[PDB]
Each structure stands twice: as C-alpha cells, then as structure tokens.
Structure 1
Amino acid sequence: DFPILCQTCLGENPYIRMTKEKYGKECKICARPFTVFRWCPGVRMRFKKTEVCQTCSKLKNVCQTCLLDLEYGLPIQVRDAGLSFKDDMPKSDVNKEYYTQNMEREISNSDGTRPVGMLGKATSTSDMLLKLARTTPYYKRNRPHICSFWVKGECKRGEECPYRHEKPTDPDDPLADQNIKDRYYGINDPVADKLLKRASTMPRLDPPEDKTITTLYVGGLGDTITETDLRNHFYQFGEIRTITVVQRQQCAFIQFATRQAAEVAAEKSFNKLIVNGRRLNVKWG
C-alpha cells in the first residue's frame, strides 16, 4: 500500500486521487505481479503508473515510476559513478529470480525504511552529484506522448486530441533509445553518460599550477566580511602558514603548511562555500 515516489511524479497539486490494483502488472525487472498505482499528476498530464515493484526500488533506492534516486533525482548509473558500483545484482535470469527472492526476505527483516546495504554506504556523498543534482521539479516529464497521427500529418480529433502536437525527437540522437532494464542496471545509459560529460567540465579539482604553492587567490570577498570569518572557517584544515588580505580589489590570499590542505580548501570550497550570506570565490595565484 502506497507507492514509493519522486516528488516530481506525484504531482504539483497537493490534492490527489490515486487508484490501486492488487496485482496489476508484472514489474519490468524482477517480473512479478505487484500492486500498481495510477493517479493524474496535473491538468495536462498523462496518468502515470508505477513501473516497478516496490522491492526492487528499495533495492536500488528509487522512485517506482521514474527510477531516479529519491534524494538526487539522478539515473542510477550516475549515482553509482558517484559512489559504489559494487552493489550489483544479478542480471541473468534464474539468478535474478533467486537473488530477488532472498533479498526480499532480507528486506522483510529490516526496519522497513532503508534501502538495504546501500544505505550503509548512502550517507557519504556530495562529491559531485550534489552539484549536478537537480534542484526543482521537472514537469516537462509528465507531458502526454506525441500524437502519432499528427506526426504523420493526419490527426482527425482536432483540438480535442489529448496527445501532444509537435515535432518529435530525431531518431539520430543517441539519447533516444533508452531501454528500461538498461536504465535500471546502469549500462550504457545515454542520459547518464551525458551527465557524466557534464560532470567533467565543472571547473574544480585539477589545480596544481605550481609545486608547494598553498597561496589562495580569493575573488569576490566583499567589504562586509572580516578575516575572522576566514580563520574560523579554515582552522578545520590544519596549520595555517599565513593569510594575506587585500580589500582594494577585495581579493584575499592564503597560505597553509602543506599544498594538500590548499587543494582541500579548494575542493571543499570551490563554487560551494558561502559565509556572511555572500559567495566566497577561490582561484590559484
């Protein structure tokens, strides 16, 4: 009873009518019958319905319809590229059936609210994916499918047509093909790969222009801030060597015992840290 859901599926209305079938469909993964839920998300929306059984969601920690993580809204291949691939799960036939069975007993014996072993891992995060995690609901995802009479030029329902009248996606784009099983296991997922390419460009971690340099060239200081903000932020890292301050261009230089600590302060800092409700931007030299 009650599905497991994204906030993005469930709807942008707080009031929702949602129907239930006892054994509605096989799950497209572990292939068992399971309680299925439909509901209307919104005014122009599509009537989504749960695609996979609740168990294999608890297993990989995901929405039932979307298969996007609960916290990050990221396809599974991504958050695995983000932490731990070694979760695994047999893809192969009768194994899948077997492992699902056992893991279904293991889950039965848990407190109920926890994605099994992954959650022991799931706490430690934020490497990148937080910064590539999506922020707001994305409703373009629930729109009705593309009317396929109209996309041949004919559709004779006129304005009534609940489907959507517009140009489809060119089958050329590798982002088209998108199997379900595939998106689930984290194989060759085009979306996930795209997000990976997007991850790399994040100006961030390579640093190291020069050896031993712990000099921090800090842009976007501002004249509200004091140094004491700086120190009481940065004593976490280690033994400071010193701090140079310039308020004429509002840039603050810093120096630490080891370069390692400076890299760190970059990492922890870059395009993340803000104090005095004002962004504190960092660069090398």
Structure 2
Amino acid sequence: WEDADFPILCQTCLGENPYIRMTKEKYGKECKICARPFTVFRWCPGVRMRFKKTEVCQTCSKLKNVCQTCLLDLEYGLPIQVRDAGLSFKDDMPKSDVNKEYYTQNMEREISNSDGTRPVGMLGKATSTSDMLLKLARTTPYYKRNRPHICSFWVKGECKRGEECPYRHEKPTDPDDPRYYGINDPVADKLLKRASTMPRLDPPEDKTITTLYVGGLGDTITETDLRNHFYQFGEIRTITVVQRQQCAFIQFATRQAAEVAAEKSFNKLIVNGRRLNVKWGRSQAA
C-alpha cells in the first residue's frame, strides 16, 4: 500500500558513522500500529551495535512528527506524550482495528499527499515551543539505544558461542521498569523528574522576598524590557537598573505575581538570548 524513498530517522538511530550503508525492501514488514506494508530499511549504526530496521510507516511518522524506528520526537528526541502534554494538545487517533482507525489513516494520508514536508496538524503549535521542553532535550545522545539486546544462554549460562556471541552478556534486566500515546512507564518517571528539579529552598517566612537579585544585564536587557516583562506580572513598587553589576531590582505589592517570576527565573527566564543571573535578594532592611 505504501512506497518510500528515504526514511525519517532521528539522529541517534543513524549511529556515529557519517558513512552508513543501508538496504531497502519494496513491501517489507507491516506497520506495528496500522498493519500497513511500508518499505523496511536496514543498516548498521555502529560496530558494536544491532541493526535497528524500521518500525512504522512514513504515514504514521508524519502524523506525530516521530522518527522511524525508536519512536521519539523528530524535533527533540523525546517521547510522544511528553510532546503532546508539553504542547497541551493530543491530535487524537483511534485505538481499534477499523472503528475509525484505517479510515482516519487512509484519509489523513489522502490529505497529506501534497506537502510531504511537515506534520499534518502539529505545524501550528510546534512554533510556540522551546520553553518547557527545551530544558529536557538531551543532545549528544546516548547510543545504548543501538546496542544489541541481551542474549539468552548467557542468562542461562549455556552460550557456546563464547566471545563471538554478537548480542550481549552480563546485563541481566530487571523486571520492575522497562505504546504510541499512553500510557508509557518511564515517561511517568520523567515527568516526575521534571516536576521535582533542584531549586533553592523556600525560606521560612510569609512571602517577604518580593525583591530578587536578578542580573547579567550586560547589553541585552534594558529597563523597559524587564519592566514590561514584569508589567504583565503586575505593578512595581521600586525599580532600579544598577549597571555597575549589570542588574535590575523589581518588587511587587502583594508578592504573588512576582512569585511566579521566582518560578520563571531559577536560571530559567530566557529572554533576549541569555541564561540570566539569579540569586536571592535581601528583603531584610540590609
């Protein structure tokens, strides 16, 4: 039902060689979601690595901007529901065999024949990004994805192959933590990992820290930039732009709005292209 010319393939699946040789079939396996006969491709990423063929069709990759074999985001290198919750919209797709399943895949293929360049509905909200997902977009990826999976007969100690057992050995997997949207087991741990970062301790008082030592102004931040980034928060009581240290001092009347500034700027408020400098002010008449 489907031909192709070249696969989607995020960068960690290609392997560390710029010179890889790759083979193709014409109607290979089926897609592991929609049973559609794509063209399976196979290659060797690296010299200690399994072959990692091709898992879903080009259509089921163009739907969710997903790579071709490891099923991660093509823009980030992240799972699917991390992206869809991080963009707060799911781009629904049915679950059963026909019930709207191959119907909607067929029709979304029929209205994807023109472009072949971008995902079908994610294009509008893949622009308003880079705030909540960019903190976890692991560049320089780990190639343990590509290592060959663990053999039996070392698990049973029987492996007569000796050294030339191509798969692996002495990696016993653990039966406590190992589809396409939800629910996936390590993703819950990763969203707990992002919800539970390492901040500064919240000091024992009643919201007196409306001042904060934010600095690293340099030549990027100006006065109206930071006070219009705080005017959407609310009202000041005293601003200054102290340029001996390249810093700015803002407060709020009844702290709460500047409270989310403390949530926005734990080395995190990224405007004008800079990791801003943040440590804690006085609020102590000092």
Asked whether the two chains share a fold, i.e. TM above 0.5, the reply is: yes
- Contact 1:238–1:261 (8 Å) recurs in 2: yes
Question: What is the TM-score with the length of structure 1 in the denominator?
Answer: 0.78
Instruction: Judging by fraction of residues, say which structure has more helix.
Output: 1
How far apart, in 2, do the equivalents of 1:17 and 1:130 lie?
Answer: 32
Over residues 72-107 of structure 1, what are the superposed CA-to-partner deviations in whole Å (9 max), with x where a residue is unaligned? 211112112212343110011213533444443444
Are 1:240 and 1:257, in contact at CA under 8 Å, matched by a contact in 2?
Answer: yes
Which moves more between the two structures, 266-275 or 86-95?
266-275
Structure 1, unaligned stretches of length 5 or more? 175-182
Aligned mate of 1:123, from 117, 124, 127: 127
- 1:246–1:252 CA contact under 8 A, matched in 2: yes
CA, structure 1 residues 279+97, in 2 after alignment: closer, same or farther (shift >3 Å)? closer
Cα deviation 1:233-253 (Å, max 9, x = unaligned): 978978754346889999864
- After superposition, the C-alpha distances for 1:202-243 in whole angstroms (9 at most, x for unaligned) are 539999975696422348899999999977997897875434
Check whether the contact 2:112–2:120 (CA below 8 A) recurs between aligned residues.
no
Deviations 1:82-135 (A, max 9, x none): 123431100112135334444434443442211101221222123422112212
Native 8 Å contact 1:218 1:280 kept in 2: yes
Indicate if the aligned counterparts of 2:73 and 2:79 stay in contact, CA closer than 8 A.
Answer: yes
Structure 2 unmatched runs, 5+ = 282-286
SS of corresponding position for 1:245: strand
* Secondary structure in structure 2 of the residue aligned to 1:240: coil
Conservation of the 8 A alpha-carbon contact between 2:177 and 2:185: no
Residues 54, 68 of structure 2: 8 Å contact kept: yes
2:163 and 2:125 mapped to 1: Cα distance?
51
Q: Are residues 81 and 28 of structure 1, via their aligned partners in 2, closer, same or farther at CA, if it must alter by over 3 Å?
A: same
Cα deviation, residue 65, structure 1 = 0.4
Q: TM-score, normalised by structure 2?
A: 0.78
1:193/1:235 Cα in 2 relative to 1: closer, same or farther (>3 Å)? Answer: same
Residues 211 and 234 of structure 1: CA distance in aligned 2, closer, same or farther (over 3 Å): closer
Query: In 2 relative to 1, CA 228–82 (structure 1 residues): closer, same or farther, beyond 3 Å?
Result: closer
Asked if the contact 2:59/2:109 (under 8 Å) is kept, the reply is no
Q: Is 6-15 or 77-86 further displaced after alignment?
A: 77-86
Whole-Å Cα distance in 2 between the matches of residues 223 and 57 of structure 1?
A: 43
Aligned-pair CA distance for 1:35: 0.7
Stretch moving more, 250-259 or 7-16: 250-259
Distance 2:271 2:43 in 1: 43
- Matches of 1:111 and 1:45 in 2, distance apart? 35
CA distance in 2, matches of 1:274, 1:133: 16
CA distance in 2, matches of 1:254, 1:150: 64
CA-atom RMSD in angstroms: 4.1
SS for the counterpart of 1:24 is: coil
1:52 CA drift (Å): 0.3
Which residue in the other structure is 1:30 paired with? 34
Change (3 A) 1:188 1:141: closer
The farther-off stretch of 249-258 and 38-47 is 249-258
The answer (yes or no) to whether the contact 1:82–1:127 under 8 Å persists in 2 is no
Check conservation: 1:78, 1:196, Cα contact below 8 A. Answer: no
Measure how far apart 1:39 and its partner are: 0.7
Greater shift in the superposed pair: 206-215 or 69-78: 206-215
1:204 and 1:267 in contact (8 A); partners too? no
Name which of structure 1's ranges 220-229 and 206-215 shifts more when overlaid on structure 2.
Answer: 220-229
Do the aligned partners of residues 120 and 161 (structure 1) sit closer, same or farther apart at CA in structure 2, a change above 3 Å counting?
A: same
Retained in 1: the 8 A contact 2:64–2:122?
yes
The range that moved more, 211-220 or 76-85, is 211-220
1:20 and 1:149 map into 2 onto residues whose CA distance is 32
Q: Contact (CA 8 Å) 1:205, 1:266: kept in 2 or not? A: no
When structure 1 is superposed on structure 2, of 227-236 and 191-200 the one drifting more is: 227-236
1:128-167 CA distances to partner (integer Å, 9 max, x unpaired)? 2211221222101100111211111121111111111113
Q: Identify if the C-alpha distance between structure 1 residues 54 and 207 changes in structure 2 by more than 3 Å, giving closer, same or farther.
A: farther
- Alignment partner of 1:206 is 2:202: yes
**Change in CA separation of 1:205 and 1:76 when aligned onto 2, cut-off 3 Å:** farther
8 Å Cα contact 1:68/1:74 also seen in 2: yes
Residue identity over aligned pairs, in percent, reads: 100
Q: Summarize the Cα distance change of 1:155–1:57 in structure 2 as closer, same or farther, 3 Å threshold.
A: same
1:20 touches 1:38 (CA, 8 Å); kept in 2? yes
Q: 1:204 to 1:114 in 2, by over 3 A?
A: farther
